Enzyme design. Sequence first.
Site, PDB file in Angstrom:
ATOM      1  N   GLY H  30      10.105  95.281  34.114  1.00  0.00           N
ATOM      2  CA  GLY H  30      10.756  96.127  35.087  1.00  0.00           C
ATOM      3  C   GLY H  30      11.949  95.461  35.739  1.00  0.00           C
ATOM      4  CB  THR H  31      14.726  96.920  37.697  1.00  0.00           C
ATOM      5  OG1 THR H  31      14.018  97.619  38.728  1.00  0.00           O
ATOM      6  CG2 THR H  31      15.059  97.883  36.571  1.00  0.00           C
ATOM      7  CB  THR H  32      14.823  91.641  39.508  1.00  0.00           C
ATOM      8  OG1 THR H  32      14.417  90.660  40.469  1.00  0.00           O
ATOM      9  CG2 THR H  32      16.270  92.019  39.760  1.00  0.00           C
ATOM     10  CD  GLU H  47      18.526  94.640  37.847  1.00  0.00           C
ATOM     11  OE1 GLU H  47      17.326  94.469  37.550  1.00  0.00           O
ATOM     12  OE2 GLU H  47      19.462  94.077  37.244  1.00  0.00           O
ATOM     13  CB  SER H  75       9.486  95.511  39.243  1.00  0.00           C
ATOM     14  OG  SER H  75       8.581  94.439  39.104  1.00  0.00           O
TER      15      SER H  75
END
Lengths: 194, 233, 250, 220, 239, 212, 196, 244, 204
Positions: H30-32, H47, H75
């Site tokens: 996943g996105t940070t 993010e 995330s």
Amino acid sequence: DIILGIRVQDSVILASSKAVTRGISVLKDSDDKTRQLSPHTLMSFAGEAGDTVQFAEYIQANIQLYSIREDYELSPQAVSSFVRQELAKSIRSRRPYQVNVLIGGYDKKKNKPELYQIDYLGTKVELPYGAHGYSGFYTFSLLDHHYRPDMTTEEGLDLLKLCVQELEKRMPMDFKGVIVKIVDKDGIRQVDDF
Amino acid sequence: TQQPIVTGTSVISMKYDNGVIIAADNLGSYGSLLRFNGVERLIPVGDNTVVGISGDISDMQHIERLLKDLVTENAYDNPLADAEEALEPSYIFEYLATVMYQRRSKMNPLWNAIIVAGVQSNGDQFLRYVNLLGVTYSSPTLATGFGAHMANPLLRKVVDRESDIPKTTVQVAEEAIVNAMRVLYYRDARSSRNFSLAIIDKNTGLTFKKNLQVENMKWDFAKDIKGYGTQKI
Amino acid sequence: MTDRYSFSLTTFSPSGKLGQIDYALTAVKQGVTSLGIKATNGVVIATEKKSSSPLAMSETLSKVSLLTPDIGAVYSGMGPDYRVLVDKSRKVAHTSYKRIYGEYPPTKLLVSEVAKIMQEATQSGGVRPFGVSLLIAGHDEFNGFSLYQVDPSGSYFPWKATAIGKGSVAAKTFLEKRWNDELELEDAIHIALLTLKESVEGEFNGDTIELAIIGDENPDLLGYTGIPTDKGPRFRKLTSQEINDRLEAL
Amino acid sequence: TTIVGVKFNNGVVIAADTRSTQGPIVADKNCAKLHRISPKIWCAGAGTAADTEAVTQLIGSNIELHSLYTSREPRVVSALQMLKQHLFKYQGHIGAYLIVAGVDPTGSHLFSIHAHGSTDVGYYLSLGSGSLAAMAVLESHWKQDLTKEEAIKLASDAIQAGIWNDLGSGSNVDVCVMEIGKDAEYLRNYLTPNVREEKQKSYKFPRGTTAVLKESIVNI
Amino acid sequence: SRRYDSRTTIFSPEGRLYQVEYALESISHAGTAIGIMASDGIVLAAERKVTSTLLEQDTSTEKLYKLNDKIAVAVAGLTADAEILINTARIHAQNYLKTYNEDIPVEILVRRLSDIKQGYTQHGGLRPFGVSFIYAGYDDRYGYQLYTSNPSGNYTGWKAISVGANTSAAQTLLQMDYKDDMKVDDAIELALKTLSKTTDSSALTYDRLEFATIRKDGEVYQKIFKPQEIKDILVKTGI
Amino acid sequence: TTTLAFRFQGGIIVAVDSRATAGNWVASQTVKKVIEINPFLLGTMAGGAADCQFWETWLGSQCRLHELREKERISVAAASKILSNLVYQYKGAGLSMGTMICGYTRKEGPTIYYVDSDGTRLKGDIFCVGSGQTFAYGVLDSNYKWDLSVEDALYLGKRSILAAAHRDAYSGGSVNLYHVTEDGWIYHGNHDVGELFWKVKEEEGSFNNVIG
Amino acid sequence: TSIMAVTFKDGVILDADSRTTTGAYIANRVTDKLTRVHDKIWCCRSGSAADTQAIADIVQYHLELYTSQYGTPSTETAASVFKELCYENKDNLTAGIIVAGYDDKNKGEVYTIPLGGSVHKLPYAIAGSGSTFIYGYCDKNFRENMSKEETVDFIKHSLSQAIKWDGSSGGVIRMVVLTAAGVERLIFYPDEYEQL
Amino acid sequence: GTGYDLSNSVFSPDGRNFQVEYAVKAVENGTTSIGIKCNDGVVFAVEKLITSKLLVPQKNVKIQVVDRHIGCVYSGLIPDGRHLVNRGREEAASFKKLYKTPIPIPAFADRLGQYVQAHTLYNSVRPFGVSTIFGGVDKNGAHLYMLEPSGSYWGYKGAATGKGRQSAKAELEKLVDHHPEGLSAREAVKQAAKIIYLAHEDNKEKDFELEISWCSLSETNGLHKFVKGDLLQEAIDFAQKEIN
Amino acid sequence: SDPSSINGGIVVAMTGKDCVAIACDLRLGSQSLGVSNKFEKIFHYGHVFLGITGLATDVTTLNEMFRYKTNLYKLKEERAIEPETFTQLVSSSLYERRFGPYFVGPVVAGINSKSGKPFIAGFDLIGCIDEAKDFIVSGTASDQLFGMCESLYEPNLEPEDLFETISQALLNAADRDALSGWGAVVYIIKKDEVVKRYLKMRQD
């Protein structure tokens, strides 16, 4: 409301009024207040308007279901024991069946007639002659005087004529005569000249 | 099925040319005993709604809790919760009217009479009533409980019909509400001398006036009354 | 989220054996040995207490437990199953019998209720059989002193003397030689200790051994006086001092 | 019914009469009104006789099971909690008014539980129709630091006041003494002040006085 | 949980219920039970499988059970499973008496248990009962009746039947010696002769035998023989 | 209310009034008290208007489902028992009903089943229900015959309701005549009681106590 | 009855009489109507004895369960737990409660929960049958931030009059003083307050 | 380790629940998202990868508020995070209804941990494929927590998750070293933006949109609010300036 | 209105010297109307006798219940239920329906097969064990029986003398009760045999 039953030596005689009254008027004067539970078992009933026939037809289905299932006819004692149990279950249920029944049958194995009186509470008692409600107030004095265990069916019918005549004379309500049925070794038959 | 125990008395309100005014006294009566005096019965819900509640205080505090949940649940996943998606008076009223009727149908009513006063996003005044039975209605002037018999006759002289709303200013509406509150204090046994007054204006927004005081009362004519008839001295 | 094991995990194998019952019985065979001996005037049930660590207070873990004042049980196999099973046995002894008839169940009926609990686990869905065999010793006024063994399968049999667990084969051979229909309870305790002494590998003293008897009623353990019809428990644990005294005379 | 509990310097004593009435009729002249909840926790019940017997029998079962579970002597408080919670659950339909007394590792205790689930602590208590008559004696004579003998006499004297002065109480005095260090002693029929006197005549009928229709032997 | 399910209630590719076949195989390893219907009574005999000198034969009733004042059953297979069915049979027999005020007919009682066994065979996902019964009873309709039922839920009426181990040998012996007009006392012998021949031990002794009879005050009696009574007949029959 | 249905050689004649009253205020004059359950079955309203209308409308669906499954027209006996069983389930809940399930079937002939809120179900030749039933019986019991022609039977049903309408305060408005035959029921029109009374008075000479 | 709770400078004092009556009869004359629902949260019970005792037991169970999970509760939380039981069962439980407690941040707090099930935070609270006779006295004489001695003297005068005029109130006066110093229990007998 | 990883409640011979370990692999994709605990509150940053120009800016919000003082950022599987946050909102509302106070962050963190952990007990359910950084301000200060698919959670001075977690954690460690006295809420917002931009260097293949949120006693009066307008742009400018 | 008084009837139990006596009237009625003169109210479940008075439907229901329960008890226990154990079985069964109670007053009577001592116990409609060493009464005429039994009864009556005492107590109490009569039946229960006797009494 008249439901009478007399057990004689060889048969059981059940008499029930023909009148159906709803409030102000008599709707019907030829009603049959009986159901044949078995070829040799007959049930007369009386009580509240709808409960009597709903209960009687519900009982008849179970007795018929038993007969088909085991290919065997329940004895009148067993039928009355079954009928009493359902009345006992209902009297303390959400909507009790306010039905008083007479169960007359011929026990083909003991070769003896049997008459059972069960009230809406579930009070089963075997009698030589029975009646429900106030119909027994006028008739027991005659039956206590004239009944004998060894009467023939003809004498028993003659005794019902006296019991019905007394009901006609002293009971205020007009019950439009009675339908008489005889449970014998040969089955159930209706007496038409009564 | 319940009965009221500690109750708040009449709430009165009326809409004027630019908004609405709603007032209620700060009293909770326990029978004839004027027991609790710090009860706040006007419940602001956002910047454009005020919910005035009368009747059972225990149910009032339950409704006050539901309204605070609406404001929370509305802001969930709603970036526009402050503008363009905030709770309108009409949305708040329908939630309360639905709740009040649902409780009624369960024979467990909220023994309250509620007035939801506010200004819609488009500027239209909102003023609606709902009671324990779920009955709802709207009028230029609304009053609950004992105020329906005494405040409404007074408020209705100022705004008797819809066409009178644009002709009623803040000062005329406010003095009418303040005078009605004084009249209720005169003739209402379960009423308090202190009250709160809320003004929701489409321009100036919500103006909530706490601890307002009933003033300029007339008692000097009582000295001249003697006995109940024949008495002379 | 719901319980999705509504099916039976114990099923017949092509050879007719129920796999889980046989494996449950295996767990009993590696269990610590326990035995019971039925005397003319009492029953003695004994077992040894192997401690998990020397820092464990073994006195806090009773392998012999009271089901009713006149009925006691000992187990071999998995300890936790016996604990929950005893809790069930004590409960059913009250809900099913005492609360109805006013008196504690006889040993035969309580064993039946215990057997019903074990059988239910052998056929109900999403459960394994109890991995314990119980030796239930009791007394009742009509059947006298009785000793029963209950297996993981739920089958139970009455025994004059029996041993279950690791040394059952050797113990049962020993009990056959020694047991006779003339034993008194004091002699059964002597035979029980001798049989148990063979099975134990480590220390053999009152702390590593646990005994219980069903014998004469103990009115001193009743806890009250004034009701002659109440005569006291017949089940008694022999304390470590009592066992140690008998070991000196062993 | 007359029931009293009297806490004394080293325990508690509960006493009760033994008359059971069905209206004005004395159904049982020697009913035992003191019931065990555990060996050293005892209960005395007024009001409906069946509920008091049944409620204590249910709680007594749970006390025994809980005692076996915890491997501890029952607390009188555990009986009180399970007893009051049970009574409260039924909203007073179980008309059992109870005095629960006993000794546990934490001392001697004396509580009364009302049919609605309310409880009170006390050094002397009374229940039943004779409560006011019995409480008059307890108020007059109770004192701190009673000995076992003084408490038994006070408890019996209080029950006697109900026996003599209350129609619903009579016959005999049952006493149970629970002391902290020793067993509970149930003194059934501690006092029997109402022993009937000899009848003036013997009413032994001569055999054959009764008329019989038929005689039969019944198979067992 | 779907991966751990054994699918008890399914058909085999050749139209057989696997677990019922395996349950029957289990019963074939149990002690033999024999029932013989005579002109004047019924004889139920069974052979104890578990036996030891330390086992209490005096009160070890494990294969012959009483369901009613008029009906009894001999059990082969899982003893634990049977007692579950035995108690439901007893309750049903009393429920029938409570309702109709008459003793339950033997066939009605047998049909109810067979319906209970069949239920586990068709739905619910639980394993079948691994028990076969021999019902011996009396009623006014058919007189002395002898039934047998197996885990499949199928039941049949018999004049002489054996269940458990060595049913093939036991049945063949019964075919050779069963006479329709035989009395109970002859059925006592035939049951013991058949067991003594099909027994897996060296000889048949009273400790290994469960034995009961139903016979006619003119009222049917049930006698579950005590060990000394069994020892007596074994000598009389010559075994 | 006054509703009657009687059996005769030509089938069944169902006649009903059309007055509904809320106390003494006559709410309506043209209430349809016959529910046309099917082209072959007729209901009848007495007592609970909503209970009769709703359940006899529901009963038509049950009769239709029986048609679709059995591919045969439901009997009047079965139709009346379906309603009777349901009316009994709600017994004591507050249902009010008195109705005649009129129908004519090949295997069964002309059939009238009177079903009421008590759970009663009666087969009969003549039934009258409502406040004015006793007045309808008076005319029917004396003039009713099995051998009535269709024209005479229709008049008898029309006349019977007129008698109840005249004497009963809660009956009147108009007489709705239905005739049940081998091929369904036939609607014989709505007759205004006000107009019919004067028409009947002149032709029969009856109601001699009424001036006019 | 007659129950009372007064906030003062160092904390809060709960007080009550000791009489419980079933009609004219005094069933128990030394009852303890002060109930501990938490270490520094106590409640006074008025109305039905069975209902108030049941509620107090349940509230104590909830606050005990709260403390193990979410730390020590505040007096507001204890009153909130009382409200849910008193309000959600207002048709059955006829219970009027005064909840007083102490915490370091808020000092002494008093919450009254009248028969309706509403919650009101007050500087002092009075309830029970005998409270009606001292509404005027308490209002005229109560002061903010009185010392412990003044509050006890104020409470003794208040209850002595409630006991004097109410038949269903009397006995000994039981006080619980909740402060930072801990919980202190005081008892005043009729010979002490009756001749004030 | 195969064989023991096809079910959720199964222990492997080593005691490791592999399905929960595979759920962690979903988080690492996943996105940070990060969370920084400042001296009077918490700051959340996530993010948001711009898959295509057709995504409308500023509408696909990924930070969530619970009640009014808790903010949740996660995330991994976004639908799972919404499921977990939906439960937290139910848990938070239930606590407030019964106890009348907003649910404490340590109390809230336990409510979520019990729910996430309960999904590792049965094989009829799947573990959460999200690590949730959540926190807020309550009666006794600010709190920052971080859940894992296993239900484990601890309090953090600064938490980071997602693909750029390893990069972000390096700068979070620098913040605590450089600012042991406590970082200010406004400076934490600027630092939060810088960390996300640096962590995005692991996702250079695609463009991203920075979303910040925070809950400070002094600046939001203890309520959770988003960074928007001028304050957001200063953080974006600072983050770009440090990058350049 | 009162269910226990609709059908009438009375039962009395007395204890003697190693013998018990239990007797009842045979009337069944509907208030004033007498329906049957053969309605027996004493039932036995082995060597333990149960006399049930009250509503006739509940008397019949409990007979089939205790027959059901005692029949299952003897199958599981393999022995007949003793009077003391049966007394608690009746008590619990009646309490199981505290809020749906049977309007019946039962009377247990029997001799413990093991200890051999007479036993009689009484009950309310919800199961209060009224264990008495002298006599137990039930039914509509309990008031009459109490005074009648309390005067005639004396301890340790022989089986022949016990029959005269219990029968005389029953007949004279029944004669003064409107809803009781139409014959009576007396069981004399001894450790070895039971004798059942029908009494001659007024038929009005």
